[PDB]
Amino acid sequence: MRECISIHVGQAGVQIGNACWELYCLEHGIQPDGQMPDSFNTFFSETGAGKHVPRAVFVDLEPTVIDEVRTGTYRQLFHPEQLITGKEDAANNYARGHYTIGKEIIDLVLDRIRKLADQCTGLQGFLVFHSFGGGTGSGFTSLLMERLSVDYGKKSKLEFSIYPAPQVSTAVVEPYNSILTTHTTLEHSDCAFMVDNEAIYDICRRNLDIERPTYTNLNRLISQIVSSITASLRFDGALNVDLTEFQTNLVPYPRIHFPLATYAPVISAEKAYHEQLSVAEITNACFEPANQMVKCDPRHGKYMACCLLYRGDVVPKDVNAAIATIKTKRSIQFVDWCPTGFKVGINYQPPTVVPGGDLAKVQRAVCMLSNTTAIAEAWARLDHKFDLMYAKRAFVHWYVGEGMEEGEFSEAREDMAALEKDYEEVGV
Amino acid sequence: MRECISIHVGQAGVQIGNACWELYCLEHGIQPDGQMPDSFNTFFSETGAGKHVPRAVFVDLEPTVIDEVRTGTYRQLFHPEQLITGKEDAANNYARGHYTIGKEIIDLVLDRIRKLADQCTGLQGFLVFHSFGGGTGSGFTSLLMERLSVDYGKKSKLEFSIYPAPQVSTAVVEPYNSILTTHTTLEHSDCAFMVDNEAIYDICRRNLDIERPTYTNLNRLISQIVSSITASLRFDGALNVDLTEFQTNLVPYPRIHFPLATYAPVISAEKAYHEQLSVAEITNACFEPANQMVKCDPRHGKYMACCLLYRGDVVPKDVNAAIATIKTKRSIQFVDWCPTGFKVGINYQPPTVVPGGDLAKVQRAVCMLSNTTAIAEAWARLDHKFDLMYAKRAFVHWYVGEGMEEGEFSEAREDMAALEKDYEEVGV
Amino acid sequence: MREIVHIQAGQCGNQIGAKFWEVISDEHGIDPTGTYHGDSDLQLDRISVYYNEATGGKYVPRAILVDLEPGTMDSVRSGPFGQIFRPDNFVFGQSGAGNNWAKGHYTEGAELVDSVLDVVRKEAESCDCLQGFQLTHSLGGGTGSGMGTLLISKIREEYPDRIMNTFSVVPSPKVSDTVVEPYNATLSVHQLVENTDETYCIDNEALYDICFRTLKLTTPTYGDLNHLVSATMSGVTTCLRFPGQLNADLRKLAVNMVPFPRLHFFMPGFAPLTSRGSQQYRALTVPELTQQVFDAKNMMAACDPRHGRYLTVAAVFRGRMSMKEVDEQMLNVQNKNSSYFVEWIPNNVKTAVCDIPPRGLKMAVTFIGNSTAIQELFKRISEQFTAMFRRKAFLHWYTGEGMDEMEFTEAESNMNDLVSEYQQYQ
Ligand SMILES: Nc1nc2c(ncn2[C@@H]2O[C@H](COP(=O)(O)CP(=O)(O)OP(=O)(O)O)[C@@H](O)[C@H]2O)c(=O)[nH]1
Ligand SMILES: Nc1nc2c(ncn2[C@@H]2O[C@H](COP(=O)(O)OP(=O)(O)OP(=O)(O)O)[C@@H](O)[C@H]2O)c(=O)[nH]1
Ligand SMILES: Nc1nc2c(ncn2[C@@H]2O[C@H](COP(=O)(O)OP(=O)(O)OP(=O)(O)O)[C@@H](O)[C@H]2O)c(=O)[nH]1
Ligand SMILES: [Mg+2]
Ligand SMILES: [Mg+2]
C-alpha cells in the first residue's frame, strides 16, 4: 500500500543511485532481468506478470553518466522514458542549471513524475540525491524543489546531499554553489541530510583497512545508510519509524532541519571474527567523533534530538540500558529544554551484504541521524571561503553571463549569515 | 445482417485503404487468396463458396496508384469492376476534379455503388477516405458527396480526411483546396474526422522510437483508429456503440460536426515489457496534448462531447473511476451547458497486430473522438494563409482556365469566416 | 445478558488485544476456526458476554480494531486466532498520524471515526443489554491517543448511562520512545479526566523490572509484556464470565474505588509471578499471595507507592479459598501499614472471589489500587512539558493543524488542577 518516489539529480545522484538500486535488488532477491524467481511493493511496481520496475527518475544534462547505466548490467531494469538526458552540461555552475538550461528539461520530467506519482496510491514522501558543489545538483535541484511545492506542498521530501570539504575538495568554484543552493533548501526542503567525502575517506582508511578507496566504496557505504532510513517501511519489526514520524521527532524548528548521519559497525571480514559486536559498543560507535559523516566536532556540539534505527538481532531490554548509559555520560550532552531526546526504532531483518563487498556480514547495525549545534560551525568557514572569493569579484563574470543579477549574491550571503546565529540563539 | 460501404477517393484514400484492408484480413483469418481456412459479414460478402470480396470502391484519375494494387499481393482480393481508373489526373487542383474531369467517372461509379449497395440489406453508413489538400480528394469528393444526398440522404456518412499542416506541408496550392472543399462538407457530410501528418510524425518519433518513418507507418496507425470505430459492429462486447448512436451522442448542432481522434497506447516492442499498461494511464494518454491527431491546443479548447471506445481486457468497474477522475480534474474542462459529456464503449476482442508491425502487441487500447473548440483555432491560420495567397491573385489563372468563376472564391472564404465565429458563439 | 464490546487502537494497544483475545479464548476453550472443544460446562454459561454465537456453532469476538495505517493489521491476521475475528470489524486508514496528537485528534482521526461510529452501533444493537465498553490504546504517540480520545467523548452523547474503561500506557522517563511524549500526554490526558469512569495507568519501565528480577527471564520481548498486561484485563472481568462465592462486577468496583469525581486513575498489579526456579520452592498460599501483592517493586506503575496513602484498595481472587484466610490477611496488612492508608476513610479493603481459576495455575490475585503516589508519574511529565514549552520547541507540527498556544495552557492548567487533587487529601 505504502509508496515512495526516488529522484536522482546530477552525476553524483546518478552514481550514488545505481549502488542503492543494486542493494535493493539484492535485498528482495531480484536479478537484473527484473523477474523474481509483498515487502518490495514500495520501490518496485510489478508490471503485468514478473517485471519489477523501480520508482525512479534520473536527470542529467550530459549523456555520459546516464548512458553508463543503459549499456551495463542494469540495461534491463530501466527504460528510456525513465532516463532523461540533456545536451549542454551544467559545467560546474549554478546559473547554467537554474536559469538558462533548466527551463527545457524540467518540463519533460514533471509530466513523467506525475505519471509515476499518480500510479502509486500511498505516497509517503520524496527522496532527492545530489551535491551542493555540483552544477546540475545545485541549479536544477533548486528549480525542481521550487516546482514541487506547487503540486504537493505538505507531502514530505528528503535529500541526501554531498557537502563540500574545507581541505579535500575537487572543484574551485564550489563555495559559490553551496551558498546559492541553500536559499531554496530552507524554504522548500523538509529535512536534508549531509555527508562529506573527506569524513568518509578517513572511515574507509581506518576501519575497513583499504588504503586505496574510490567512489564505488563510498557509494556502497551511502546505500546502506539510505536503506537504514527506509528499512522501517519495507519490513515489520516490533517497533516502527515511518518518515512522517521521523520528521515529527527529529526536526524541532522551522529554520533548523539539517541533521547529520552516522553508521556502525563498518569493519573488515577478518576483523569481524575477533571483534565481539555488542549493542552497547555499537551505540558508542555512533557517538564517537571518528565515525561521523561530516567534518564536525561533537565535543563542541550539543544534540537537540537524534533518532536511532536498529536492524538485525535486537530486543528492547538492553536497548533501554544503552540509552540510559549515554544519558548518564557527560561527554555527550543535550540542550536544557529537551529532557528526553531519543527516538528508537527496531527491525528483525538483518542488513544485507553485496557480492564482493568491503563491509563484513554482521548481525546488528545502527544509524543515528542527529540534529545538533556541531554542524552550525561547519558553515562559518564556508562563509569565510566564499567571502574571500567574492571580495575581489573572482569567477563572477561567468555567472553574470548566464543571467545572474548581482543582488542575488548579496541575498544568499546575508541570509546564510543570519542563519548561523539562529543555532546560537537556540543553544543559549 | 448489418453492412457498411467503404469508398476510397484520390491517391491518399487508396494508400490508406490498402493497409486497412490488410488489417481487416488479419483480423478474420483470411489470406490474400480470399478463402478462409459470422462476424466478418459486414465488410466481406461470401461469393458462392469461399471467396470473400470487400465492400469497396477505389476511385482514381491516374492508373499508377490503382495498378499498384492490381500487381501486388492483393491481386486476388479485388476485380477490375471494383477498381475504377481515369486518364488525365486532377493535378493537385479542385477545379479539374469537380467540373471538367469529374463528369465522366462519377457516372460509372454511381452504378457500381448501387450494384454493391443494393446487394447488402442492412446499410449502416458510408465511409469516404481522402485528403482536403489533394486534387482528386477535394474536387471529386465534393461532387460525389453532392450526388449521394440525392439517392440516400438520411443514410449516414463518415469521412477520415487528411488535414493540411501550417509548417510541414508537401504542396503549394493546398490552402485553396481546403477552403473550396469545405463548402460541400458542411451541407452533406454528417460527421468528418480530421488527422494531420505533422501530428502523426511527432508521435511516430517520440513514442515508437523510429526516427525514419514513411507513409506505410502512418497508414498502419490510421487503420487501427479506423478499426476502433467499426469494432463495435463486428464483435459483441458487454456494451456497444453503433454509428447512428455515435452520431447522436457526439454531434450536438447542425453546423459543428468536426470532432478529432486520438489513439493510445502506441509504444515499441521493448517498451511494452517495462511499461505497466493501466486503464487510468491509457485514459490520461487520450487527454494529453502530445498524443492528439491534429495540430491543436487542448489547453485553450473545451470538450463539448467525446466518445471513448475500449477494446480488449476491460470491465466497467474501473472505467467509472477513470471517468470520475477526469471530471474531477480542472486541466480538462467542459462547456457549462453539458454536465454529462461522455459516451463509453467496451469490447472483448483484443486489437490485432500486423506481421512486422511497429506497434507492440497489447491487451488494452482506447480511441477518443472529441468535439471541441480546440480545432476552431486551426482554421484561423488556414484562412490567413489562404487570404494572402488570394490577395494578389496568385495561382488563380489556372483555376479560371478549368471553368471556375471568380465569385466561387468569395463564396467559400466568407462562409468559412462565418463558421469560425459559430464555435465562439457556442462556447461563450 | 450483560455484554461488553471491546475497542482497540494504536500499535501497542492492538498488539495487546491480539494476545488478550487469545488468552480469553484459551480460558473458555475456543479454537482458530471458532468451534468449541472444551469440557467444563460453565465456560459455555456466560459465553455471551465476550462472544456472539454465530451460525454453525462458530463463536466470534465482539471487537473493533482501529488504526491510521494498514501495517499493524497484517501480523494480526497471520498470527494465532487471527481467523476468529470478523472481517467486517477491522477499520484502517491510509494516512497515519506520525506521532502527533494534533494530527490524530482533529484532521486524520475525524475522517476515520465516522466508519467506527456506525460499526459500534450495530454491535450495540446486537447484544441484549450492553453494560460498558473496554478500550485499549497508548498516550505516547498520536495514533492511539488522538483517535481513541476523539472516539470516547462521542460515546458519552449516545450512551451517557454506561460504564467506561480505558487501559492506557503512559510514558516513562528512562525508557523514552519518542521525543514529544510530554506534549502528547499533556493534551491526551485532558479529555480522559471528565469523560472516563476508570483508567489503568501501566508503564513499561516497571514491567521490565518485574521481568528481570521476579521471572528471571534472560531474553525478554514485547510478547512477554503483552502476555502480562492481558492477564490483568482477564482478572478484572472474571466475575462476569464465571460464577463465584462472592461476585464483583465492573460497576460495583467503580462504585467502591472511585470516591470523588476527578480522582479515578488506578494502578494495576498481578500475582503470583514465579520463575522456573521459584515455581517449585514458593509455597502458594493466601498469606504468601497477599504479602507479595503489596510490595512497591511488584507494581505495574513505575512509582514509589509508599510516599503516600492508598485512598481505596480492591482485589479479585481466583480459585477456591477459605474466606477467614482471605479476609483476615487484608486486615492484618492494614494493621501493619497504618501510616500507608487514609485514616478518614476507615476500612479501605474490597475483596472478590471466583471459583474458576486461570489453565495451569491454582490461584491468582489482581490488585487495583488508588493512591496519592500517582503525583510522581504526572509531576515529571509536567516538568518535561514546562521544559519543552518554555522555548516553543516542536511547536510548528502542532500549530500547523490549527492549535493556539493558549490551547496548550488550557489543558496544562487542567492537568495541574488534577495533580493538585491528590495533594489536597495526602
Ligand atoms: N506492552 C507493550 N508496549 C509497547 C509495545 N510496543 C510499543 N510499546 C510502548 O508504547 C509506546 C509507543 O506506543 P505506540 O507505538 O502504539 C504510539 P502510536 O501507535 O499511538 O502512534 P504511531 O506510532 O504514530 O502510530 C512506547 O513508549 C513503548 O514503550 C508492545 O508491543 N507491548
Ligand atoms: N561520495 C561521492 N561524491 C561524488 C561522486 N561523484 C561526484 N561526487 C562529488 O560531487 C562533486 C561534483 O559534482 P557532480 O555531480 O560531478 O556535478 P554535476 O552536478 O553532475 O554537474 P556537471 O558535472 O556539470 O554535470 C564533487 O565535489 C565530488 O566530490 C560519487 O560517486 N560519490
Ligand atoms: N497520412 C498520409 N497522407 C498522405 C498519403 N499520401 C498522400 N498524403 C497527403 O495527401 C496530400 C496529397 O494528396 P494526393 O492524394 O496525392 O492528391 P490526389 O487527390 O490523389 O490528386 P492527384 O495526386 O493529382 O491524383 C499531401 O498533403 C500528403 O501529405 C499517405 O499515404 N498517408
Ligand atoms: Mg556532470
Ligand atoms: Mg495523385
Ligand SMILES: [Mg+2]
Ligand atoms: Mg501506529
